[PDB]
């Protein structure tokens, strides 16, 4: 029996890389936020950074405040920045990333002030993740090419492996990096979400958290009805995730943005909201 929250993580000190996603309009965008909020608050001596590849420019949107090609400290804080931006597999995916690295380090160096923990918003298209396996399936044929030659193709391949190992070693340590995913109480979520997890493990990636969202708590007819949906489901999860941060989360009516509204939300990423108690605070962002 483990914890429902991400408190435990809101305060990691060795996490310089967090990946958030959730195939669906399950809402993980706000996720990507309500997390990169709880962190700075409770580690303000940490310049943090939350960015997205979702072309949609959802972040700012979800923020009622515009962001772009370069790191911009949130308006309201002083430690939480935000930044919107060969036929083989994995390829593109990596580079995609890769360039990011550099494009990011520019932004800390050329900035001066540097970032501590970095928070991702895997494209609604999921993750370019693919590429971890990269240097493996590339290990077999590296030796094939070797046996025959016994220079540029070898070069690139070794570089990729290198990079991935360096990124991978830091990356394939559950302590600087790990992977929360958002997903709600419905067949297509579950399954699909579940799927997510597999590919991740398939990348040997630590991953310990689940954010279920837009729950109900009807304690109107179709409401309570609908409610049962979710419930038939919540459990499903609970049962098969004992060892998980399966974090139930409630659903405040309609739009919810404005750093104001947002912060006062994310609190429940800590003290996992309780309907009965914390039920007052809810209708607060429902106006």
């Amino acid at each position: 029996t483990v914890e429902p929250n991400l408190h435990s993580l809101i305060t990691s000190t060795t996490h310089k890389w967090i990946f958030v996603g959730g195939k669906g309009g399950v809402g993980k965008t706000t996720s990507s936020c309500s997390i990169a909020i709880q962190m700075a608050l409770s580690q303000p001596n940490k310049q943090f950074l939350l960015i997205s590849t979702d072309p949609a420019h959802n972040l700012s949107d979800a923020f009622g405040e515009k962001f772009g090609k370069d790191a911009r400290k949130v308006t309201g804080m002083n430690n939480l920045s935000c930044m919107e931006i060969g036929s083989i597999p994995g390829i593109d995916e990596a580079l995609s990333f890769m360039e990011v690295m550099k494009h990011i380090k520019r932004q800390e160096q050329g900035e001066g002030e540097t970032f501590d923990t970095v928070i991702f918003d895997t494209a609604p298209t999921g993750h370019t993740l693919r590429f971890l396996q990269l240097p493996n399936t590339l290990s077999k044929l590296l030796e094939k090419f070797g046996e025959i030659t016994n220079v540029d193709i070898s070069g690139k391949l070794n570089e990729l492996k290198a990079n991935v190992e360096t990124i991978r070693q830091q990356f394939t340590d559950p302590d600087l990096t790990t992977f929360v995913c958002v997903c709600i109480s419905e067949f297509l979520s579950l399954y699909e979400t579940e799927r997510l997890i597999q590919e991740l493990i398939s990348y040997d990636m630590d991953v310990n958290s689940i954010i279920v969202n837009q729950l109900l708590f009807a304690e109107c007819k179709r409401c309570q009805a609908r409610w049962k949906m979710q419930k038939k489901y919540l459990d499903q999860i609970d049962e098969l995730y004992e060892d998980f941060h399966v974090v139930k989360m409630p659903l405040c009516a309609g739009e919810i943005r404005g750093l104001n509204n947002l912060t006062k939300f994310s609190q429940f990423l800590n003290k996992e909201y309780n309907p009965i108690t914390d039920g007052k605070v809810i209708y607060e962002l429902e106006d």
Partner: peptide
């Protein structure tokens, strides 16, 4: 060592996954 415990839980999940049979788990869930 509260942290470690978390690692063990993750690992236990992996054993369950390696042990569990994702293909089989998927079949029952379906």
């Amino acid at each position: 060592t509260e942290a470690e415990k978390r690692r063990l839980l993750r690992e236990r999940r992996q054993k369950k996954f390696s042990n569990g049979g994702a293909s089989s788990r998927l079949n029952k869930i379906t």
